[PDB]
Design a protein around this nucleic acid. Structure first.
Ligand SMILES: [Zn+2]
Ligand SMILES: [Zn+2]
Length: 75
DNA sequence: ACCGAAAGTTCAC
DNA sequence: GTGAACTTTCGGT
């Protein structure tokens, strides 16, 4: 939806469940094949590339979604 | 060879 | 100025 163009999907999770970041032809967990639980060791960046930033909150604080040149309220 | 995930980037409000 | 959204490339299976 906000992340990927898929209305049913929300952008969180993945087809394989080995990640979280997805907004294109990556892995929309619609049907899936059942794989989540506690499956650790998954390299995904859900948030912005900024190490100091965590992705929460914006520079103006009027929004929350930021993962590029939008609004990191920190380093 | 095919499928999935991620980077960097770009358009609209 | 800020937020929000797309295409393409690389890596893994
Ligand atoms: Zn999706
Ligand atoms: Zn950040």
């Amino acid at each position: 939806l906000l992340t990927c163009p898929t209305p049913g999907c929300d952008g969180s999770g993945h087809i394989t469940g080995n990640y979280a970041s997805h907004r294109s032809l990556s892995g929309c967990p619609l049907a899936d094949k059942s794989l989540r639980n506690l499956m650790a060791a998954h390299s995904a960046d859900l948030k912005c590339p900024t190490p100091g930033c965590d992705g929460s909150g914006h520079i103006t604080g009027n929004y929350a979604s930021h993962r590029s040149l939008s609004g990191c309220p920190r380093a």
